[PDB]
Amino acid sequence: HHHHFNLPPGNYKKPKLLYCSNGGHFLRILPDGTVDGTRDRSDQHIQLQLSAESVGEVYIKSTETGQYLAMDTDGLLYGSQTPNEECLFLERLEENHYNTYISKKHAEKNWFVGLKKNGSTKRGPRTHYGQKAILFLPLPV
């Protein structure tokens, strides 16, 4: 492991909104495969079904479109029509409270799912432990 194994509480039974502490955006996977954040709680593309692969590993799937959150080779989040290596994230507790999502594929590089204050996703290399951008709270839909 390149990362700790503090796991967040909760389960994957229900879809979640992934609310980002940073700008208060919900992670959104748009139908065209774009990923960003929106503050609009009624948005139909922020309802995400997480599911476990191995313990601490998740897929993050748009319930609306079926797209999997994925991070590509250059660290960009995208919506994938099919689950692939890029779609696995290490879901961890952070600051004893939040959820973070580390690209499994790029775990050694500490590439996280992150939203900027302006609602744009962070590119993997731009994310780091310590950032607000990487901190998510899974909220009930």
Curated annotation (Swiss-Prot):
MF GO annotations: fibroblast growth factor receptor binding; growth factor activity; heparin binding; integrin binding; S100 protein binding
Effect annotated for changing K122A: Loss of LRRC59-binding
Binding, heparin: N22
Tagged with keyword Aminoacyl-tRNA synthetase: no
Effect of mutating K116E: Reduced integrin-binding. Defective in integrin-, heparin- and FGFR1-binding, and defective in inducing FGF1 signaling, cell proliferation and cell migration
GO cellular component: cell cortex; cytoplasm; cytosol; extracellular matrix; extracellular region; extracellular space; nucleoplasm; nucleus
Heparin-binding: annotated segments: 116-132
Pfam families in the cross-refs: FGF
Post-translational modification: In the nucleus, phosphorylated by PKC/PRKCD.
Effect upon mutating Y98A: No effect on integrin- and heparin-binding, loss of FGFR1-binding, defective in inducing FGF1 signaling, cell proliferation and cell migration
Domain of life, per lineage: Eukaryota
Protein name according to UniProt: Fibroblast growth factor 1
Species annotation: Homo sapiens (Human)
Gene designation: FGF1
